[PDB]
Design a protein around this nucleic acid. Sequence first.
DNA 1: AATAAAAGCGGAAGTG
DNA 2: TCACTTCCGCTTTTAT
Length: 91
Amino acid sequence: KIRLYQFLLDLLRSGDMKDSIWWVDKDKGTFQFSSKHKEALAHRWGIQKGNRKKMTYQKMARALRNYGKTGEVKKVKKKLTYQFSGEVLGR
DNA sequence: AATAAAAGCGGAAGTG
DNA sequence: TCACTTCCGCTTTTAT
Ligand SMILES: N=C(N)c1ccc2nc(-c3ccc(-c4nc5ccc(C(=N)N)cc5[nH]4)[se]3)[nH]c2c1
């Protein structure tokens, strides 16, 4: 199956939802969600998974915080900003 | 100086 | 066993 952080990375490289997600420093690995359009993205996440209920950003973000222990994604002290790890980008 | 609102946190049970 | 999902409760930041 697919993993969460991959679903995000792909769009960031595809620009499929530029209105909902964008790079802050595409080199450093930072990205940020639109405070207004974040729901329309989490909605598409719950669709690609086929969950019983519709996916809300609050629930999706609850998943991101579980990447903290492994390092895949670490929250930033900024608003709605997270950071990928190097291994995911490539090396 | 208090607030209402938004963001963020995390345990626990549950799911495909 | 995984990778979340869902739920509820609390805590923290910000804007006004
Ligand atoms: N009214 C508004 N227009 C408004 C606008 C912007 C806002 N930016 C925030 C927050 C930013 C960071 C927050 C936060 N960092 C936390 C760390 C730990 C915990 C915890 N539970 N340990 C909780 C945390 N919450 Se909230 N709130 C806003 C409101």
